[PDB]
């Protein structure tokens, strides 16, 4: 599956994994920390 | 008082009809 | 008529003549390249200016060069 891992390392597959990662990071943040308009403490 | 009933058909129906004619005849003239 | 000039960066690979849809271009003997030949534009009265010649020139900053000039009934490509 070395060719399958080179397919997993192509541009749109990395794009759709990394954008789901950076989407579902910010989404879990806005679940556990609702409505951040201002930098609080 | 008769000026808008006379100058407006001349300027829009008569003098452009000269301009649709005399400025068109000048286009296709054969150069000597 | 259009202005079709060529330049001494010609490598003589005669691709502008094959690309020409109007037989404006032709290959002339010359001694500035390995192919011993350079193009020419003897028939620029028939040129339309469609620039297929300089889609086919391989030399960087094209050796053939069409300059769009006055338009006759042959430069406009009219059957009428």
């Amino acid at each position: 599956m070395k060719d399958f891992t080179t397919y997993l390392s192509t541009a749109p597959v990395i794009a759709t994994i990394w954008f789901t990662f950076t989407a579902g990071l910010l989404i879990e943040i806005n679940r556990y920390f609702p409505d951040p308009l201002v930098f609080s403490f | 008082s008769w000026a808008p009933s006379v100058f407006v058909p001349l300027t829009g129906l008569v003098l452009p009809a000269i301009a649709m004619a005399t400025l068109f005849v000048y286009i296709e003239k054969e150069a000597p | 008529a259009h202005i079709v000039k060529i330049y001494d960066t010609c490598i003589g690979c005669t691709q502008c003549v094959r690309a020409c849809p109007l037989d404006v271009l032709e290959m002339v003997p010359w001694d500035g390249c390995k192919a011993s030949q350079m193009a020419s534009a003897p028939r620029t009265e028939d040129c339309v200016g469609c620039k297929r010649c300089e889609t086919a020139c391989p030399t960087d900053f094209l050796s053939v060069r069409v300059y769009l000039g006055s338009e006759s009934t042959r430069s406009m490509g009219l059957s009428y």
């Binding site: 390392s9 192509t10 541009a11 609702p34 409505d35 201002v38 930098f39 609080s40 403490f41 | - | -």
Partner: protein, 164 residues
């Protein structure tokens, strides 16, 4: 009150708008059974709403005549009056991540230029090299100023121009 403004914990249009939103949620809630699944989500929306108003009034945001929080985007009026978390703290919390990505991509380009053919590792990204540059790019402003002090950040007039 910096520029004709007022604290949101002081203004009454802010509290009136809170009561307006809770009134819309209440008249929306009045249709359902008290323990059903829509009513739980509506009361959770009310709880998030009231927590949002409490934490906007707590941080000292400035309301206007409209009853809406404002952002003072000037240091020296944010640092002096305690509004640095509005713009002045996230204007570096952004730029760390911006220069982070701009440094990681820069180093991924420069570390792939000197290969057999670079373009194949730009459509097919070398993932161990990418994750190595992802982790070790954490100190990017440090490495950026150490690269600027060389002159290895810029390139000289070896660059490509037209006809100056």
């Amino acid at each position: 009150d910096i520029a004709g403004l007022t604290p949101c914990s002081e203004s009454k249009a802010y509290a009136k708008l809170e009561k307006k939103e809770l009134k819309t949620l209440e008249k929306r809630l009045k249709q359902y059974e008290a323990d059903s699944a829509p009513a739980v989500a509506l009361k959770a929306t009310m709880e998030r709403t009231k927590a949002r108003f409490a934490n906007y009034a707590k941080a000292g945001l400035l309301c206007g005549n409209d009853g809406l929080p404002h952002l003072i985007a000037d240091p020296g009026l944010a640092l002096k009056y305690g509004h640095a978390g509005e713009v002045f703290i996230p204007t570096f919390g952004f730029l760390y991540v911006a220069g982070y990505i701009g440094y990681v991509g820069r180093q991924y380009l420069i570390a792939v230029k000197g290969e057999a053919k670079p373009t194949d590792k730009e459509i097919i990204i070398d993932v161990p090299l990418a994750t190595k540059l992802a982790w070790q790019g954490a100190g990017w402003p440090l490495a950026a100023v150490q690269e600027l002090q060389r002159g290895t950040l810029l390139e000289k007039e070896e660059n490509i121009t037209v006809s100056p």
